[PDB]
A paper describes a structure:
To provide a molecular basis for designing better drugs targeting polymerases, [name] fever virus DNA Polymerase X ([name]) was used as a model for the study. As the simplest DNA polymerase identified to date, [name] belongs to the polymerase X family and is constituted of 174 amino acids. In this chemical reaction, metal-ion A (MeA) is a catalytic ion and decreases the pKa of 3′-OH, facilitating its attack on the α-phosphate of the incoming dNTP, and metal-ion B (MeB) stabilizes the dNTP-DNA-polymerase complex and increases the electrophilicity of the phosphorus center.
In contrast, when using DNA-II (with 3′-OH) and dNTP (dGTP, dGTPαSe-I, or dGTPαSe-II), the DNA extension reaction took place to form DNApost, and the phosphodiester bond was formed (the after-reaction state, with the bond formation), followed by solving the absolute configuration of the Se-atom-modified P-center on DNApost in the product complex (the product-template–polymerase complex: nat-dG_pro, dGSe-I_pro, or dGSe-II_pro). In detail, we designed the crystallization trials with dGTP and dGTPαSe to form the products (DNApost: 5′-CGGATCC-dG-3′ and 5′-CGGATCC-dG(Se)-3′) from a self-complementary primer (5′-CGGATCC-3′) with one overhang 5′-dC-nucleotide. The 3′-OH attacked the incoming dGTP or dGTPαSe diastereomers in the crystallization conditions, thereby generating DNApost and forming the native and Se-modified product complexes. In the determined structures, the clear 2Fo-Fc electron-density maps and polder maps indicated that the three dNTPs were individually incorporated into the three DNApost products. The determined overall structures reached the atomic resolution, and the P-center configurations of these three product complexes (nat-dG_pro, dGSe-I_pro, and dGSe-II_pro) were solved as well. Though one nat-dG_pro complex and two dGSe_pro complexes belonged to P212121 and P21 space groups, respectively, their structures with the polymerase were virtually identical, especially the two dGSe_pro structures (RMSD: 0.2 Å).
Author numbering: -1 to 174
DNA sequence: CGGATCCG
DNA sequence: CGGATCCG
């Protein structure tokens, strides 16, 4: 995959917002734009992008086996590099060039944890998770855990989650 | 099928 | 830090 400018990345994301679907028992089901979240370095507003990352919120657990393994993009030709229920890396054709598109899935209850994780950057997440680890927690893209048991937090949004964990909220571009 | 190498 | 996917 080639490099994208921030503007080029946003044009691709806007194009894909209405064009993602998946096959379920032989029927095409379109993914709702509200269930597609730009994440990764594009969400952090980096000037150049190595790839475009999209998080797909899956409303029902029964569909995880179906969404990414049967993912479809209207119009654009693409190839599958790797694909499973949780991560699918595609090489898409866009204006006569090939780019890397990373798709990730989160279930509804995981959404703020997934937004936090997939926004990154890695260095930011490592220091936050290291701090929680010393207090006997484990943080991942699925939830907050203590002794491998989910700790349910009274939060809905990524912002609420970051503050409930004990950290000041930073806008994505300022996370480092 | 698991060490290697991806993903944030 | 923590997790996902598959080449070999
Ligand atoms: Mn990325």
């Amino acid at each position: 995959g080639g490099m994208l400018t921030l503007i080029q990345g946003k044009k691709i994301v806007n194009h894909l917002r209405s064009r993602l679907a998946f096959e379920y028992n032989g029927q095409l089901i379109k993914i709702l734009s509200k269930n597609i979240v730009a994440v990764g370095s594009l969400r952090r507003e980096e000037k150049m992008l190595n790839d475009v990352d999209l998080l797909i919120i899956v409303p029902e657990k029964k569909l995880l086996k179906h969404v990414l393994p049967n993912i479809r993009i209207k119009g654009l030709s693409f190839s599958v590099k790797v694909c499973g229920e949780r991560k699918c890396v595609l090489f898409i054709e866009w204006e006569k060039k090939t780019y890397q598109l990373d798709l990730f899935t989160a279930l509804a209850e995981e959404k703020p944890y997934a937004i936090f994780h997939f926004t990154g950057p890695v260095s930011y997440l490592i220091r936050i998770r290291a701090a929680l680890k010393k207090k006997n927690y484990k943080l991942n893209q699925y939830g907050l855990f203590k002794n491998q048991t989910l700790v349910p937090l009274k939060i809905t949004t990524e912002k609420e989650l970051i503050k409930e964990l004990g950290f000041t909220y930073r806008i994505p571009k300022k996370r480092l």
